[PDB]
Structures are given as C-alpha cells and as structure tokens.
Design a protein around this ligand. Structure first.
Ligand SMILES: [Zn+2]
Lengths: 126, 102, 171, 49, 121, 134, 454
RNA sequence: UUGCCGUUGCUAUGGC
C-alpha cells in the first residue's frame, strides 16, 4: 500500500502513466494506492488548472485515508504516518520529501522517472 | 546375488535365434559381470553357453538395474557364423588381427 | 541469472544477510538466481492479470501457472487465484530447496548440518541420492526425503572413521 | 564463503538484541523476574504525531 | 449447546486429522490429556483437539477453560479412535496438541487449520 | 492444373498447435491417469540437472522404446549433440523449476490464433452456425 | 461462462489437432507391429485377463456350513492359503506364532499341524539395522504369504524382517531385513503362478523379491502414508493403497511407473444431491484392496465405503457408502457422568458422533464375479459385481463371525459349472495394526470358515 | 476345535 502525493500525481499525468497499472508493473505486485485527505486538499487548492489531476485522483481504484490534524501539509502528514507504522511505500517526487523518506529507515520510495515508476528502498523487486 | 529378467522375447528363424531385452538387477553389487551373466542366461535358457550373447549394457544412475540386449542361439557353429567378429573376439574364440601399416 | 538494479543499497545488503544466514546460502548467486526466475514468473502473472476475464490466454495459462506452482509447492492447494502468484516471493521459493527441507524435517540440526549431509550424500529423495543443496523438492517428493540406505545414518555399514577407531580399539 | 555468512549473521542477530527487544520464545520456567532491571522513568513507546 | 460444543463436521475433521498425522510424524504433536494440559500451561501449543465421545466428557472438558485463559484454539473431533489412529499410536487418544515450532515443515498447513477452527470458534 | 504428391500435406504434423497450457488442461480434465514415475527415478544427475520435464520424459520413453525395438544404442553424434544437448540443458536450467517448465510464461505466442478458433469449421454462414449448433 | 469457454476451446483444440468409415482402412505401421506381435513369444504372464468367471447369482448363499474354529492365540492377524494346479493354510498372530493348517478335508473344520513361535529369544544382540539377520520374530508378525508353488511361506511384521519358512517343516530358510529403522512390512502378495513377492513397507516403500533366488528385485517408491495394503495377479502389475493419502496406486513394476487414483467424495455436494428431494459424509483413509481382474479393482475405505475402480478412470466408477453399518453410539451410562438422562442425552448431540464401521478386510476372488467384505459388524458380506462391470450389489451375509475380520480369502473346489468354496476369515478381537477397538461384543480369536456350495 | 478357565457334546457355545 502506497501513499501518493501531489507532485507524484502531476508527474504521472505528465509522463502518461496510469496510477495502479504503473504501480503494478513497477513492483510486479498488487498495489493499493492511498490519497490522504491532505494530499487531496492540496490537489483541490492547486486550482482549476489541475482539474485533470484532481479527477484522476478521484478514482474508485485509489482508496483514501482520513488524516486527523489541522492544516493541509501533506509532507508532514506522510512523514508522520510512515514513521509511525513502517507498512507503507511512499510515492513522491519532492526532493525534500524524498530526502526525508530515504533518511528514515525501512521505508521504500517510489518516484516517476523516465516513462515508468521506479522504486528504491524495497529490496525485493525482482 | 544377481537377478535376471527377460522381456519381449521374439524368435528370428532367418538368423536361427531368439532375442530379448535383459533387465539385470544387482542391488549392492557393482555391475552386470557379463560372463557370469552369460552363465546365468545359459542356465535359465537351454545349455548353448557359447551360443548365448549379450551386448548392449546401460546401467541406470545409482546402480541396481542395467538394460542389455540378449540374443541366444541354438547351434554354436551357426552362432559363430551369425555373430560379428568383434563380439567373437570379446567373448568366444575368434582372434584375427588387422595388418598394422600406414 | 542477473544482478539487481541497485545492488548495493543497505536494505538489499541486510536482506541478503538475513536470507543467506537463515537459509545457509554460500553467496549472493543463490538469491539472485531464484529471484531472477521468480521475477520472470510474476512478471508473466502480471500480464495475465492485465488481460481480462474469459481471455483464452488468461484462462489456460492462468490455471496452468497456478497448478504447476502448486506442484512445485510454493503455493498451497486452496489459494487457486492468480493474485497469490503476485504475493509470492523469494523465500517462499528457497524454503523449497533440499537443505531447508532436510533441516525442517529434522534429519539435521541446522541448515549447515543439512548442507554437509547433502554434499556428503547421506540424503536421498525417493530412489536417487541427491547431492546438491539447492534442489527445489516438490510436493510429492516432500515426504520421501530420508537418509540414504548406503549411509551410516541410514542403516548401512559405518564409515571409515568409525571402522578405523573400532579396529584400533580392537588392537 | 559459507562459514563467513554463518558468522556474520550470528553477529547480526546478536546485535539485533541490542537495538530492538527480541521475542526469545516466551516464559521458560518459573517467572524469576526481570533479571536485568526495571526503569520507572523510561517509556520506550512510539507517540503519535 | 452441548458441553463438547465446537464440534467439527466431516471435511474439517479430516483436514484436522491429516495435519495431526503429519505433526505426529514431525514430532510436533503432544498426545494425551495431561500432556496436552502440560504443554498448554507451558504455552507451547498452537491448537488442541479434544475428542467428543470418550467415556466421561468432563475428563477433557477441563481443557477448554485453559485454552480460553491463554487464547488457544480448541476443536472437537467426533472420534477418539480415529484421533488415536491419526496420532499414530496403538490406542485411542482423547486429546492432543500441536506444539509451536518455526523450524517446522508444516507451518502453513497448521496455520490454515488454525484459521478454519478459529472461524468455527 | 495438375496434382503433385505432397507429403507435407499428408504428413502428421500435430506440433504447430501443441500448446502446453491446453495440454495441461487436458491432463487435468482427462479422467484417466497419467503414468508418473516412482518419485526418485526421474531426477537426473543426483540433482545436478533438474528433475526432468514432461517433454523430456516423453522423449526419453520414445528413445528407449525405439532402443529396445531395434536393438541399437544411440550415439554421441557431435553436431547434433553440441546443438541439442547443451542448448537443451541450458534452457532446462533456465526455465525448468522443480520438474515444471515456466519458459512458456516468458514467451510471446498467441494461443487462440494458431491452436484455438477452428479454421475448417469456421461456420461463415448464419445457416451453417445454426446447423452446427442444432 | 468461463468453464463453458474452457470446454469449448478445448474441443476446438482437439479438433484442430485431429486436423493436423471407408472400405479400405489399413495402416502400415499398425499392421507391421501386428506382424511383430505374431512373431513374438510369451503369451503367458501378460494376459490382460477380463472377468471370465461369471457366477455371482449362480451359487447358493444363505445356507453355508459355517464353522468358527476358535483357536488359542491372541489377535490373529493374517491368513495365507494354497492350491496346486492336499491344501494347506497358514495363520499368524500377535503372539508371534505362525501356525500351519490342513484345509483340504473340505466338509469339516481345519486341522492344526505345526507351530512356529518366535519370542523374546530372537531380539538381536546389536540394535543395528543391517545385522537384523536372526532366525525368528521378536515383534508383531503382521502378514503371511504362501508361495503359488507351495515350497515356502514368507512372513513378516513390525520387526522389519522377511523370514521365509519352508512348507514341509516350518523352518526359517532365509532372513532378509528391510535395512532401515521404520521398515515395518504391512502387506505381502505373490504375483500369481510365480516366485515373486511384493511387500509393502511403511517407509512409503514397496519392496519386491524373488524368493527361490533369495534376491530383491526392485524397490519402488511413491505413496504418501504407510502402504497399508497390496494386491497382485498373474501380470507384473501391482496395486497398492496407502492409508491416509486417500489414493490407490497401481505399478508397472518393470517400467517403475504408476497410475494414481484419488478418492473425492464430499458431503457438501452429496447432501445437495440428497437435498434435491441422510447420514453420509467424506472419507477417512483408504485401507484394503484386491485386484479383481487386470482392468478393475476394489478398495475398502475407513468410512465404510467399498469402491470399484477401473484402469481407465481416475475417479471411481462405483461407490457403496455404508457397507457394514454404523457403530452403536456410546451409552448414556458411559458418556457424561451427570445424573439425569436429559443431560446425558444432550451429550450425544443427536446423530453427529455416530461413526461407521470401517471395512478391515476385502477379498476379490481373482477374475470372478464376487467379492467378500469383513469388519466387526459380526456379519461378513458377499457382493457380486454386475456383468457390465459398472456396479456391484449385496448378495447375502455370512453371520457366524463375531469379531474383527483381519483377513478374508477363499478356497476353491468343484469343476467349471458346479463349484463349492470355503471362505476363510481370520477373526480377532483387535485390529491388525493397533488396538483402537472398544466394545468387544462377544468376539473370539478364531478362524471363521464357511462352506458355500453350487 | 486352544492359552486358560465355564457350560461341556458322548458337538457347539461365552467370559477373561
Ligand atoms: Zn493528512
């Protein structure tokens, strides 16, 4: 189960990768993608330029969590809920969030690179 | 103690012969011991010990079984006629050497 | 086989450390070989999922794949679905090798005792003495892994150390 | 090459007892006590956010 | 509700008895009522099988209270004779226990039977 | 024009369409048993090779049948062995895992194109498909 | 519909494989192989013999002369007989004694001839598995087998030995151990008109021997539980059944290959089949066999099934669910320990813990139309198989055998249209492998002989 | 008709 954020969705649509099919042929496993309410709040706050990205995040195949905090800082929410539990893949393309996630141990990181998704800290990919 | 099993016994009257496949069974022995096998074959069939012959021995992996090709003759003279000369050199009585030159 | 993408990240090093220590492996090539052909297996099962229901390829190659995976023994009899082939992984494959199985059946005291029993030929599945440790026993050869009858841990004549000690103590 | 990975895995799983607390297998005999001390000030539990 | 309540039907009974036979071959089965309660209070037990037709029934009904205390699955097979025959001994047994082991070659089968009898229970 | 004797059209091919997924489904739904070996007898070089695949034990059975049938050992013919034995054993240790070959799942070859979707009974009429059902 | 599409695509596949009755219908390779068939020898052992003795309804049933000769041996275990082409029989017990009988005095009870009793004297002085070459049995002789020619009887049991005794003196001529620790033999069968023995040993192993050469032919592997029963006919095929793996295998012993046959009755689909309008259920353990002819055999299960199997069908052809009844439920004075009959009846759960008798002996007369089943219901059953070979049916019962029937086999007399047989059945008060058997209801350790006629 | 023991038959049963 993979936590998505907003620039990962934007780079997915910019590189024409499907979310669940890109995840499946990246990991060769069955993926459950998760949009937290703060990532969804960030996509809605991005305005009416990003309508395509918002209604591709509105997808019944993409399940969605319910964050319980004030504010819509998705990087704080993703970092907290991943270092609490260590049962999550983080799909992101922010340089700062990528550095945070790859500094906390045991957390695999997925990112749009080239024309498909790549995964780094998951040691069983083939 | 070796053990013997004949299978698919046919008769060749044109070659005055009776031929078959030979499942040779030697648990905790090395291999077929072909002269002793000709003895055992010549006593399970009739006498003709210089007219019984085996040639095609393949032991399977781990030992125990080996499949050979058994052909038994009546009339040791016509066995000497019909068998090839290298098998006669191997088992019976014939010995003619080739002239070693060039 | 083939090397992985990032072969030197610390998760991969601790992964291979746990795998080689828990299964008594000699080097990285065991993990890399069995993971390469597992990658082929579930890269195929991914495409069998990306095609639809009632596709001929999906029906026939899917039940073929899960039945020969069940007969290799990495997949149990009741999960006859094709997403469990994706849930499959590498230690499910190298729990099936003969060293792991000899230790789990208890003919040996550790995986290293199992490896030296196998390479010293005291272990025979069925009829034949198997002597390499990475053998991938199947679900029907799972219960005939026993000591070889040609071996002193079976019932055979004792080896050279035992008989030389018996002779020297008889002297 | 095999004995080296046997003895660097034994070292690793002896270091793992230092970082985590490893489930050793439950209560062996009579419960003797904690055998190493009880700290009433330390709380080794993960707080949320 | 009888006293020997969570009885298994015939398919679950044969699944249970097959994994009992395999654990008895793999030295992972402690058989008999007081050996079962010994391994139960020691905590090395994955599930306990009681037979629901021995000549008293409270003789093994002492064990569901122990399993409840320590949260261990317990299941009632309807034949002590078939249970002893599966255990591999020349007598009927009335209770048996699958001890825990992680170097065990039947762990997936034991876990599947545990899940089946726990959804029963 | 005129006829010309064509052994390539009255020769038993039966191998352009022999697919292992269809054959496995037929072995599953066959309702007659399958002649499997006593379990140790089919591993090959003490485990240095594989177990052996189903096609390899079929071919071995054919070779031993021909062997006993006309009393002749086969040989170590160099060109054919340097092709077939080495390429066969290397793809065996590539794709045969535990007596089961998984090479097919890594191979593009359409099932329904060649081996299914009948060509003679194509039923290109509504009336012909109606009579083929009824 | 996916299974419909699977069946349809498989049908199209087989049609395409055919793609890749006239007046001339001859094939060159078939007729050449038939010329080789005309050339070959040995149309003797390899008869694929069908059922040529159709006499099931013919002979009498209900008025057999039944003599239950009780013997003083605790828990008789096996029975071996012999006919040349005087007749001797053999019994063996859990008291480590083999006993020779004469049986040819057909109208009366059998006659004891000779004991051969092992004991604690024969325990080896080594505890080492290959110097097990003593001359007697020290533990639990389970099976006897007489030679088809009658020079020897060969017996063995839980002391992992095969002792071959001479017939005329009951003397141990040769000892062959099974060379490993769990190598207990459980069933023995000679192939008919021969000197080749097939023993089924609890190592999931089947050993084969030539007795007059004192040699072992072939060890053949492949069951998954202990090989509880074995059966053979004149062909070099064999049929074994392992206990709890619920499969019966038959072995081409020269080829060392097999055909497996699993069970597969489920109370879900069976109770639905009855629900279209009932105490029957799944399967415990396939226990006993007898090869009726060289195309069919019959299996006795642990839930009282008797099943009839062909050589050409994995799933069985015919079942018979309850073959000896369901056991008497444990009494209310021996279930609960309360005071009132209402709670002691509530501790029976209705019908849920009624267990069927399990068929512990089955014997098909070779190539005939009739087989005999036995358990501790007290009454042997006689069944005949219908002439189309797709069913059998209960003819009658033989109700003079109180106890477990550890062995059934018959002894022939009379000519091609007028025949009389004595059915021997070893009767004990305890199963031939472990004890497990309570409610010993008037049993005795004897030999139930019946004389059936016409 | 057997390891004992009981009815036994002048042969069948039943308790360990
Ligand atoms: Zn949030």
């Amino acid at each position: 189960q993979v936590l998505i954020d907003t620039n990962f969705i934007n780079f997915s649509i910019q590189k024409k990768v499907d979310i669940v099919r890109g995840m499946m042929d990246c990991l060769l496993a069955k993926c459950n993608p998760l949009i937290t309410d703060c990532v969804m709040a960030e996509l809605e706050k991005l305005g009416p330029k990003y309508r395509i990205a918002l209604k591709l995040a509105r997808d019944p195949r993409i399940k969605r969590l319910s964050c319980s905090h004030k504010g819509t800082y998705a990087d704080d929410c993703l970092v907290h809920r991943v270092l609490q539990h260590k049962c999550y893949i983080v799909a992101t393309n922010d340089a700062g969030l990528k550095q945070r996630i790859r500094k906390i141990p045991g957390i695999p990181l997925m990112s749009v690179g080239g024309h498909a998704y790549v995964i780094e800290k998951l040691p069983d990919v083939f | 103690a070796v053990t013997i099993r004949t299978r698919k016994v046919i008769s060749n009257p044109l070659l005055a012969r009776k031929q078959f496949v030979v499942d040779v069974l030697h648990p905790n022995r090395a291999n077929v011991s072909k002269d002793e096998l000709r003895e055992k074959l010549a006593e399970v069939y009739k006498a003709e010990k210089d007219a019984v012959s085996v040639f095609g021995f393949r032991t399977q992996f781990g030992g125990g079984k080996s499949v050979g090709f058994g052909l038994v003759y009546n009339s040791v003279a016509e066995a000497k006629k019909f068998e090839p000369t290298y098998r006669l050199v191997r088992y019976g009585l014939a010995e003619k050497v080739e002239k070693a030159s060039r | 086989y083939s090397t992985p993408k990032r072969p030197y990240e610390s998760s991969r090093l601790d992964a291979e450390l746990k795998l080689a220590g828990e299964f008594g492996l000699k080097n990285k090539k065991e993990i890399y070989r069995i993971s390469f052909q597992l990658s082929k297996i579930r890269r195929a099962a991914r495409d069998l999922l990306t095609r639809d229901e009632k596709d001929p390829k999906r029906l026939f190659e899917g039940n073929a794949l899960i039945r020969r995976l069940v007969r290799v023994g990495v997949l149990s009899e009741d999960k006859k679905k094709l997403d469990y082939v994706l849930a499959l992984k590498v230690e499910d494959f190298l729990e099936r090798r003969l060293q792991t199985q000899v230790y789990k059946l208890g003919l040996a005291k550790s995986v290293h005792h199992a490896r030296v029993l196998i390479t010293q030929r005291h272990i025979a599945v069925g009829k034949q003495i198997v002597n390499i440790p990475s053998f991938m026993v199947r679900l029907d050869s799972e219960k005939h892994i026993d000591f070889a009858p040609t071996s002193p841990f079976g019932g055979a004549r004792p080896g050279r150390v035992a008989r030389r000690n018996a002779a020297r103590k008889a002297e | 090459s095999r004995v080296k990975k046997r003895k660097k895995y034994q070292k690793a799983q002896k270091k793992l007892k230092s970082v985590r607390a490893v489930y050793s297998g439950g209560q062996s005999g009579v419960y003797e006590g904690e055998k190493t001390g009880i700290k009433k000030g330390l709380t080794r539990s993960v707080k949320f956010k | 509700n009888p006293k020997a309540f969570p009885l298994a039907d015939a398919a679950l009974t044969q699944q249970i008895l097959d994994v009992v036979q395999q654990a008895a071959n793999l030295r992972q089965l402690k058989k008999g009522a007081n050996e079962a309660t010994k391994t139960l209070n020691r905590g090395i037990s994955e599930f306990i099988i009681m037979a629901a037709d021995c000549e008293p029934i409270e003789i093994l009904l002492h064990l569901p209270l122990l399993c409840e205390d320590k949260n261990v699955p317990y299941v009632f097979v309807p034949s002590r004779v078939a249970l002893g025959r599966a255990c591999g001994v020349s007598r009927p047994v009335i209770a048996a226990s699958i001890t825990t082991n992680d170097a065990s070659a039947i762990k997936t089968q034991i876990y599947a039977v545990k899940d089946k009898i726990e959804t029963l229970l | 024009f005129e006829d010309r004797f064509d052994a390539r059209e009255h020769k038993d091919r039966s191998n352009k369409s022999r697919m292992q997924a269809m054959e496995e489904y037929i072995r599953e739904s066959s309702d007659q048993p399958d002649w499997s070996a006593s379990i140790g007898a089919d591993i090959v070089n003490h485990g240095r090779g594989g177990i052996k695949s189903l096609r390899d034990t079929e071919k071995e059975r054919r070779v031993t049948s021909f062997e006993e049938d006309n009393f002749t050992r086969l040989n170590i013919t160099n060109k054919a062995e340097k092709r077939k034995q080495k390429q066969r054993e290397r793809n065996a240790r590539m794709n045969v895992i535990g007596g089961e070959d998984f090479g097919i799942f890594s191979s593009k070859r359409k099932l329904e194109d060649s081996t299914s979707r009948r060509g003679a009974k194509k039923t290109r009429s509504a009336w012909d498909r109606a009579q083929r059902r009824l | 519909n996916p299974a419909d599409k699977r069946r349809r695509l498989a049908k199209q596949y087989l049609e395409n494989l055919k793609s890749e009755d006239e007046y001339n219908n001859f094939d060159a390779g078939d007729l050449d192989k038939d010329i080789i068939a005309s050339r070959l020898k040995e149309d003797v052992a390899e008869q694929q013999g069908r059922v040529f003795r159709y006499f099931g309804d013919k002979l009498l049933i209900s008025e057999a002369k039944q003599s239950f000769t009780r013997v003083g041996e605790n828990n008789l275990t096996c029975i071996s007989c012999f006919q040349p082409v005087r007749l001797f029989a053999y019994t063996v017990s859990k008291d480590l004694q083999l006993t020779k009988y004469d049986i040819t005095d057909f109208s009366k009870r059998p006659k004891k001839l000779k004991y051969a009793k092992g004991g604690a004297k024969y325990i080896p002085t080594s505890k080492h598995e290959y110097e097990n070459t003593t001359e007697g049995h020290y533990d639990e002789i389970l099976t006897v087998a007489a030679s088809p020619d009658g020079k020897y009887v060969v017996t063995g049991g839980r002391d992992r030995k095969l002792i071959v005794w001479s017939t005329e003196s009951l003397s141990p001529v040769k000892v062959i151990p099974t060379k490993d620790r769990r190598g207990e033999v459980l069933s023995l069968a000679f192939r008919k008109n021969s000197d080749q023995l097939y023993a089924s040993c609890a190592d999931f192993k089947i050993r084969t021997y030539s007795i007059n050469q004192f040699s072992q032919l072939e060890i053949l592997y492949g069951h998954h539980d202990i090989v509880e029963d074995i059966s053979a006919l004149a062909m070099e095929r064999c049929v074994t059944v392992g206990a709890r793996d619920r499969t019966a295998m038959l072995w081409k012993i020269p080829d060392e290959t097999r055909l497996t046959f699993r069970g597969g009755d489920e109370p879900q689909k069976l109770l639905r089949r009855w629900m279209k309008e009932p105490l029957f259920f799944c399967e415990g353990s396939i226990d006993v066999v007898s090869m009726v002819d060289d195309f069919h055999f019959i299996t006795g299960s642990d839930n009282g099934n008797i099943c009839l199997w062909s050589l050409a069908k994995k799933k069985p052809i015919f079942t018979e669910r309850i073959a000896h009844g369901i056991l008497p439920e444990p009494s209310f004075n021996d279930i609960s320990g309360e005071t009132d009959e209402e709670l002691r009846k509530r501790q029976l759960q209705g019908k849920k813990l009624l267990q069927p008798f399990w068929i512990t002996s089955l014997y098909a007369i070779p190539y005939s139309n009739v087989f005999i089943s036995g358990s501790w219901s007290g009454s042997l059953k006689v069944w005949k198989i219908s002439d189309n070979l797709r069913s059998f049916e209960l003819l009658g019962e033989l109700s003079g055998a109180k106890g477990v029937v550890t062995k059934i086999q018959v002894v022939e007399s009379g000519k091609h249209g007028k025949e009389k047989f004595r059915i021997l059945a070893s009767i004990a008060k305890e199963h031939r492998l472990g004890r497990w058997i309570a409610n010993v209801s008037g049993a005795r350790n004897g030999i139930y002989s019946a004389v059936i006629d016409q």
